[PDB]
Design a protein around this ligand. Structure first.
Ligand SMILES: Cc1cc2nc3c(=O)[nH]c(=O)nc-3n(C[C@H](O)[C@H](O)[C@H](O)COP(=O)(O)OP(=O)(O)OC[C@H]3O[C@@H](n4cnc5c(N)ncnc54)[C@H](O)[C@@H]3O)c2cc1C
Ligand SMILES: Cc1cc2nc3c(=O)[nH]c(=O)nc-3n(C[C@H](O)[C@H](O)[C@H](O)COP(=O)(O)OP(=O)(O)OC[C@H]3O[C@@H](n4cnc5c(N)ncnc54)[C@H](O)[C@@H]3O)c2cc1C
Ligand SMILES: [Cl-]
Ligand SMILES: [Cl-]
Ligand SMILES: [Cl-]
Ligand SMILES: [Cl-]
Lengths: 459, 455
């Protein structure tokens, strides 16, 4: 006999969903959380990121009000107030997650848990051993080491929200979604911002138009983007951290943030005591039912090595609860996942980039538009809206959709439903426009911008 | 034989599209416009309404910023600057529509056109007569005749051009134009009262949209008076005294009538054309947009159907195919209302669905966007999917809150594709968004079986 029917390791997006649901089914469940209930997205990820994103937008929004007849005093921002508001909000959410677990009778152990053997965990804080019939690994991901001389002088996303003061200048190392989001946040709050990227253009693996349009808007508004940049060392000086690149260039900034990737959090977990297989990328290997190679051990979320997104971790958890406790294999579905980047301008994307599409399909029709939204007409703002549909010319199915500009994430989520449905471009065109909107442009692009046949654009 | 292959009467959304298309096909086309090229939407309709909506919205942006750490910025609005900005933009758009016509080699007549006989129009400005093989009536709609002292009130035709922002305003009518202007003026700081003849604003919309908008408007300090019929409007020394049939009076600096628009045939001389008009003033057309006179067609608001620019455009496209080269599709039209909060709606209301289907599953959510939790705003987001329990097809979708019109447009594509609720559910959420609520409502809020709600 085991102390619990199920022991969940980590109370983040996936773990907290799985544990609450199992407990509601009447199972005896425990969850270990070494930090804060709710996990990465709630405490120090998507939720506070989005709040800071909103905070940083207001200055540019006020400047748009002038064209409509408004005047106002030069705007002043107070970082300490934002930090206090963020902390109130994440504490509220944390409490609500905790309550949800407890309403389902889940016992919360406020400690790291590690495996002792296949059915036994040890709580780091006290040394207590707890046994369980089933164990769910939901430990998320962790920032890569960065071993850069002076790496330990730099901030990560774990520290970035809680600065004592807004910096005068900041260097962001990394041009993936985290780095571009925070570059635009700090720049919007009046910080002199430099972004370093190891390759030739930000947001590798996104459609090229999204990468290029974002890059160009960031540079135009005053963010410095340095490419082919590898940091050699970060050195402390009295007035700033000196970031020294391998090519000799130096950048001195008040703070330096590393945003260089997160990997599955499986080191020091005792997986080798349980016999759980971990691959060369540090991922816990799971099958189509979220099962490890040990039949009573499952894993969900970032730790399993797939795309690191909160909705996907929740999806995994739902699949796990159905499989472990029912005769009904939900299998996870990672096709046609819509993603957003809360850069400024914002990005939304689902399905295939233009380039991936043109190699995949014999005929690809591209419907592309860049336009000035009506609101920017009056305001004199340089902000455009970009929308592109990528179409398989033989089936007429819309196989990719890419959006940059205001609420691009919202827009892409919704287009993503249509793409999940494999709706054809003809159905988009048949849909009556709602006027005046931005979204109506998507249902009135009757003629293609251009077409590829066998990878080659036609003149 | 005739002066033109096609003569288009009216240069609004419908007429301008028809004329440009026909001209591009190589036809000899003329168009007559008595007022301004581009018509009601461009000049005194959707476009400037949306500009004024955006102007009003900035007020809440200033107040929401405070919770995010921005100091109060003493925002002050200046109506005269808005009006000048609007005039510049509407003039810009007008010229682009003029350029479009010229590019298609459409001969433009700046005059009212009047039928003299079934193939002949007379231009009122010059007295010139012009013959045409085919004629398209695209003359739009106009305010209803309206109430003693009604000549003291403004309509949407004058509302954009007030010399100054009023201290107070009474809006007569609780359709979409009335609720849009009530929220614009309230947002700009005007003491606003909205009068409606019935019991709840926005007749023919899903009940939740009607009720939640009503509650939000009242809650923010817009007075809404129901069962209110205006007996007369009186010019007193300091304000316009609006006297109701129930005896109640409301005195306000300005009074706007938003009481409905009817098909416009004023001065058209249709009796000479042989064209039949129905009891509501509509030029009756068949499924190919043809009047009872075989060479005279009609598109847009004048035909008596739903009054929307995109439908006028759709009518135009159908007309040119049938006339020169198809029946319009009025099913699953998405509509938006630029109230505050905004509304977006497509397909069937919950009430219309529960009578049409044996089983209707309702998926309803009301929540506070996280932006508002932090800023202290009461604004909610409301989303409702109406689903046929048998086919699982999503048959209606109703949104209220920020960017509801944008949202409804995009949901509209999926509905036009007849996507099932299971497809919505299989669509991965994007986090954090408002729109992800639409793809994670796995369990129904409630269900109707045979027209009754189940326990
Ligand atoms: C800055 C940032 C921004 C992001 N923005 C977005 C976004 O906008 N949208 C999006 O979809 N995703 C976003 N993500 C990703 C999102 O946070 C993750 O994909 C999601 O949190 C993964 O859920 P999870 O359950 O796998 O792991 P987590 O939520 O990371 O939870 C793992 C939990 O386990 C705890 N833990 C780990 N090991 C142990 C142990 N041995 N014992 C006890 N507890 C343990 C941790 O403290 C943590 O609470 C962002 C991430 C970051 C870092
Ligand atoms: C305040 C307001 C807000 C609106 N908001 C929206 C909205 O947000 N979204 C939406 O889709 N719709 C909206 N509409 C509706 C939209 O304006 C109409 O549905 C659309 O303009 C109709 O196009 P139409 O071609 O039928 O006629 P119109 O655009 O009205 O064009 C008719 C033209 O004919 C001219 N004319 C009339 N008679 C003659 C004649 N005998 N000779 C020469 N010229 C003539 C008129 O001057 C006018 O230019 C709004 C309308 C109003 C009043
Ligand atoms: Cl949850
Ligand atoms: Cl690409
Ligand atoms: Cl047009
Ligand atoms: Cl209803």
């Amino acid at each position: 006999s085991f102390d619990f029917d199920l022991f969940v390791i980590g109370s983040g997006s996936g773990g907290v969903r799985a544990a609450r649901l199992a407990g509601a089914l009447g199972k005896r469940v425990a969850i270990a959380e070494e930090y804060r209930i709710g996990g990465t997205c709630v405490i120090r990820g998507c939720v506070p990121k989005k709040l800071y994103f909103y905070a940083s937008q207001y200055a540019q929004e006020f400047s748009k009000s002038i064209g409509f007849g408004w005047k106002y005093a030069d705007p002043i921002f107070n970082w300490e107030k934002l930090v206090a508001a963020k902390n109130k909000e994440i504490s509220r959410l944390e409490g609500l997650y905790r309550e949800g677990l407890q309403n389902s009778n889940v016992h919360i152990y406020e400690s790291r848990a590690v495996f002792v053997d296949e059915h036994t965990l040890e709580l780091s804080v006290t040394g207590e051993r707890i046994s369980a019939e089933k164990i769910l690994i939901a430990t998320g991901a962790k920032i890569v080491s960065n071993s850069i001389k002076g790496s330990d002088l730099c901030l990560t996303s774990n520290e970035i929200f809680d600065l004592e003061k807004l910096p005068k200048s900041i260097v962001i190392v990394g041009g993936g979604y985290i780095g571009v989001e925070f570059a635009n946040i700090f720049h919007g709050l009046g910080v002199k911002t430099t972004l370093l990227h190891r390759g030739d253009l930000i947001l590798r693996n996104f459609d090229y138009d999204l990468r290029q349009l974002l890059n160009d808007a960031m540079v135009a508004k005053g963010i410095s983007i340095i490419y082919e940049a590898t940091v050699s060392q970060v050195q402390s000086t009295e007035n700033c951290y000196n970031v020294v690149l391998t090519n000799g260039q130096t950048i001195c900034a008040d703070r330096v943030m590393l945003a260089t990737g997160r990997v599955p959090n499986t080191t020091g977990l005792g997986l080798e005591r349980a016999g759980v297989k971990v691959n060369e990328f540090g991922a816990v290997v799971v099958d189509e039912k979220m099962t490890t190679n040990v039949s009573h051990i499952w894993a969900v979320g970032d730790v399993t090595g797939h795309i690191q997104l909160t909705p996907v971790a929740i999806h995994d958890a739902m699949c796990f609860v159905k499989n472990a406790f029912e005769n009904t294999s939900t299998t996870p579905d990672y096709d046609l996942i819509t993603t957003a980047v809360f850069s400024q301008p914002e990005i939304g994307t689902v399905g295939l980039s233009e380039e991936d599409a043109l190699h995949r399909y014999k005929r690809v029709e591209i419907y592309r538009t860049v336009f000035r939204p009506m609101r920017n007409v009056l305001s004199g703002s340089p902000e455009k809206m970009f929308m592109k549909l990528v179409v398989d010319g033989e089936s007429r199915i819309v196989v990719g959709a890419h959006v940059l500009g205001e609420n691009a994430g919202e827009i892409a989520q919704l287009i993503g439903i249509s793409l999940k449905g494999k709706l054809t471009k003809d159905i988009f065109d048949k849909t009556m426009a709602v006027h005046p909107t931005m979204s109506e442009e998507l249902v009135t692009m009757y003629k293609p911008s251009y077409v590829y046949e066998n990878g080659e654009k036609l003149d």
